[PDB]
Design a protein around this ligand. Sequence first.
Ligand SMILES: Nc1ncnc2c1ncn2[C@@H]1O[C@H](COP(=O)(O)OP(=O)(O)OP(=O)(O)O)[C@@H](O)[C@H]1O
Ligand SMILES: Nc1ncnc2c1ncn2[C@@H]1O[C@H](COP(=O)(O)OP(=O)(O)OP(=O)(O)O)[C@@H](O)[C@H]1O
Ligand SMILES: Nc1ncnc2c1ncn2[C@@H]1O[C@H](COP(=O)(O)OP(=O)(O)O)[C@@H](O)[C@H]1O
Ligand SMILES: Nc1ncnc2c1ncn2[C@@H]1O[C@H](COP(=O)(O)OP(=O)(O)O)[C@@H](O)[C@H]1O
Ligand SMILES: [Mg+2]
Ligand SMILES: [Mg+2]
Lengths: 502, 502
Amino acid sequence: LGVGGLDKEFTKIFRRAFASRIFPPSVIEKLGISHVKGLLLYGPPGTGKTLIARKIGTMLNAKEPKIVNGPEILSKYVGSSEENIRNLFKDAEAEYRAKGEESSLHIIIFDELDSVFKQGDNVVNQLLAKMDGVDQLNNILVIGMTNRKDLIDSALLRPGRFEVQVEIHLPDEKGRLQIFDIQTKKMRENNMMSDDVNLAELAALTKNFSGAEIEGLVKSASSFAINKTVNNTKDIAKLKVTREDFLNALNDVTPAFGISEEDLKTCVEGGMMLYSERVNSILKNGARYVRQVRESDKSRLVSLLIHGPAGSGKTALAAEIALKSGFPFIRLISPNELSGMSESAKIAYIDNTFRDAYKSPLNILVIDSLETLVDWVPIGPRFSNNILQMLKVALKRKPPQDRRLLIMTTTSAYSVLQQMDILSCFDNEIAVPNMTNLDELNNVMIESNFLDDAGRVKVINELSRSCPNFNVGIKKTLTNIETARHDEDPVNELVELMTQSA
Amino acid sequence: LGVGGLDKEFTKIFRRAFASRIFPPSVIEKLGISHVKGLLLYGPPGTGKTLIARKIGTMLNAKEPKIVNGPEILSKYVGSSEENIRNLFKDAEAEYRAKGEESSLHIIIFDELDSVFKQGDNVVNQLLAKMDGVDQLNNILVIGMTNRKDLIDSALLRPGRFEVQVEIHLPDEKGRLQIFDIQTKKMRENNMMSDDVNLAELAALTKNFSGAEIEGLVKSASSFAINKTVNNTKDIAKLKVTREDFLNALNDVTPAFGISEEDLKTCVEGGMMLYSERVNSILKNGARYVRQVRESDKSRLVSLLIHGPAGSGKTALAAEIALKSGFPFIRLISPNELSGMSESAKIAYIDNTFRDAYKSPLNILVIDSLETLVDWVPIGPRFSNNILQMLKVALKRKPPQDRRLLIMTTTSAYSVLQQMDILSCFDNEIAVPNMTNLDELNNVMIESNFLDDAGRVKVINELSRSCPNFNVGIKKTLTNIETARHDEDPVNELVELMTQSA
Ligand SMILES: Nc1ncnc2c1ncn2[C@@H]1O[C@H](COP(=O)(O)OP(=O)(O)OP(=O)(O)O)[C@@H](O)[C@H]1O
Ligand SMILES: Nc1ncnc2c1ncn2[C@@H]1O[C@H](COP(=O)(O)OP(=O)(O)OP(=O)(O)O)[C@@H](O)[C@H]1O
Ligand SMILES: Nc1ncnc2c1ncn2[C@@H]1O[C@H](COP(=O)(O)OP(=O)(O)O)[C@@H](O)[C@H]1O
Ligand SMILES: Nc1ncnc2c1ncn2[C@@H]1O[C@H](COP(=O)(O)OP(=O)(O)O)[C@@H](O)[C@H]1O
Ligand SMILES: [Mg+2]
Ligand SMILES: [Mg+2]
């Protein structure tokens, strides 16, 4: 037919809404049943809802559907907006006067149905009165479509109105291998496709692409072969695309529900040097929870707290554990995203982020500096109570239907979180200490190629009686080393910075 | 073609948006790909985004591009505003009905697209309908332009809408040489340009000029040579522009993204004298960080705190370090800039200043009198929490894309910042102490010729017995020395003032 990967939920639509339309009225009169008049489809954008609503009508040989946009009718002035509602059905009315129950099936698509409620009452009255009032047309069938099911009021969902509802899902790996077979077909039968490409590879790499994004990949890959030979010449009738084109294109289309990789990675890491055994222990703990979530049925939600002094290195460890996990979906929430929003906008940004994490089979979330998102200042104290009560719920709600996620949160002010008592949310606590031994500083000096070994010995010797007991974080230690590299005499400056920091 | 310095952007634009229009229709119908309908260009103003749109379309010999300006739609009356969106496409429809699919390309430029969202839903919806709806045209391509990309709703950026996005940067030194080649062409071939000029020099002095400001320079340098002949004369054919005429024009034109020279030099500095050995060490240690930021790869953000008593000389040291750096971009934020603004306007002025600093290769910021920007007063205490949380984030965010900057900030209220808990933001702290020795008072008098030295002994001989332990700042000392000079008995006046001031 033309739609891939929906073979299950395709069946249910036909069974309830259309199979009754195939039989002639005389056997329907024998049963005394009455045709359903509304259907509601919901799911994430770009998944092919309209494609279903169009392709089904071809099997009935029905009229090509009318299509309407909510925001248009709502943003039009009330006058033509009002009169446009009544103008719609005249065709479905007209053939009913001419032919009645022999009349051909009519269909109307009403897009963005939630836009009416997210603030059309006349439209809702008129739209119902034509299908459920006394002026009941039997010709019509209205398809509603929305991204959010929770905004539509139950007054529309009682029987006779929108009585059947279906959910559309992102395609799994068996499905993307079908969607490639649909999109590429014309390139294959004309032999414009090389034979080194193999679609069983491309279905595995496109780990989370939706249906609409796979076209962008095919179209983008094809655009290299054209540009390779332009600049009105021969070989126009001899063009081929190559597996090289199908691997360059993966850099020009970036998926939604993907990995934010210019965050983390190049931004959050300036090193990772295993100066002490305690670092190896923490990275082994972090990697164990990542596999427990992958390989267990019994725990779909885990959340961890990472805490310690300021500048001790918490955020780089939370990112390093994530990039090695390989999960399809990763995002973070940090103060850099929320700057300049009003409080009423901040709560909507947090809420929308969690609504996305319930749509992929595996997920990670990172929350950076929880004490800063709440606006804590100790002089009052002053803080936002509305934002605190949002997070306190979101950390306990479990995702639906065997989806699962791992949450990691970091803080510098454990004494304050204990005073708000929210510590009943977390399943475990990981503590990060500062540096405290001169042997650890020797490892840092070696690993960063400070200077030749004759110099490093004197620096350790000098501190060994000037300040044997110092206590300083790794973030500051790597700064003092880097400024002394540029002075006249590093050995006599680095000691003076470290004793000031001690 | 006549556009310079934008090599890499040109390939990326041509490959995706236009190459598909060059091949014959029969081969595109063979592949089955579909033409891209929208392209988004963003960057700083005056950098040739509109220029590119005209000069690309001439290679296709397409029709002259229509132009419409966002505020010219929005500020009209709604009725004629609404009608104009329907009017704009009338030509593209009419040719399509006459030619069908073989119609020539049409192109439309939509300027200040970010004006529509910062409040347009009708005009947004109608614009989408012509490119994404049932009535979608194949003849059009729509070019969008913005400066503040983050104001675009991501609903515009999904496949099929504004699918491709490109950033235009300020030119580097390899590029500014090409712009002078283009702009001077007519002057050189008519021989109206002297042989004493050297375009490879002027490209180096125009250290941060944008393309639109080099037109202003070349025009202004020509106006001197014209005016030199008027008050209109015979022998006009003798004209030449000369190297000196560019050196005079380079004072009449001043760029954005340049030094705020007169607000640093004339206001903040009023004599710098090396009265004591502590002052040599602060300037030496301050000049080290300026070459760390210039030369090191691994550190791209640095922030310093300068703190100490009132009137000690803190603001004059911050400006003296800046004016010797030679960095291209320098600015300061001080209470004089924000006086009389509303709290909702103060936050907007601070935010916009940091987003300019992220566009140049090297930058400095001075943030003066930190406890005054917050309005802190101890009787309540009262202060603004919304401004404090604006600064606490902005001091930690690293600049994008291998750019770098140095931040310096000054305070008198170290005992208060220790309560607001913001001292984790700063990498090093510099202390500026008061005067305490009569050798320091002697050095200040010698530098400023208070009076002949046979008198100058007596001031110290009396203070040495009247009150040796005087403790005063340099700001008050220079004020006392200047008011005694105009008296009848300078010796007693200065001794009295310093004894009282202590
Ligand atoms: N083994 C390590 N553990 C932690 N950090 C390391 C290690 N090796 C190098 N680093 C570096 O130390 C710095 C730690 O910075 P980071 O921002 O994570 O500190 P932080 O404690 O989170 O700061 P804040 O408390 O202000 O959030 C980074 O530049 C990181 O590359
Ligand atoms: N070595 C020096 N260091 C600092 N200032 C000096 C020095 N020599 C002369 N001056 C002069 O002393 C004055 C110091 O004034 P300035 O406004 O910098 O004080 P301040 O510490 O900023 O005062 P406030 O604490 O109110 O900001 C300036 O006019 C400056 O030119
Ligand atoms: N499962 C699928 N199989 C084939 N094509 C698909 C599929 N999903 C999306 N598409 C393609 O993307 C478009 C259909 O999705 P569309 O209806 O535009 O998204 P939405 O449902 O958000 O309106 C068509 O161009 C269609 O060919
Ligand atoms: N890269 C460039 N090469 C040559 N001239 C340029 C360039 N960029 C800008 N100019 C000059 O600046 C003038 C105005 O630029 P404009 O296209 O209006 O910039 P924008 O549209 O981004 O404001 C142009 O007419 C042109 O002569
Ligand atoms: Mg942190
Ligand atoms: Mg000052």
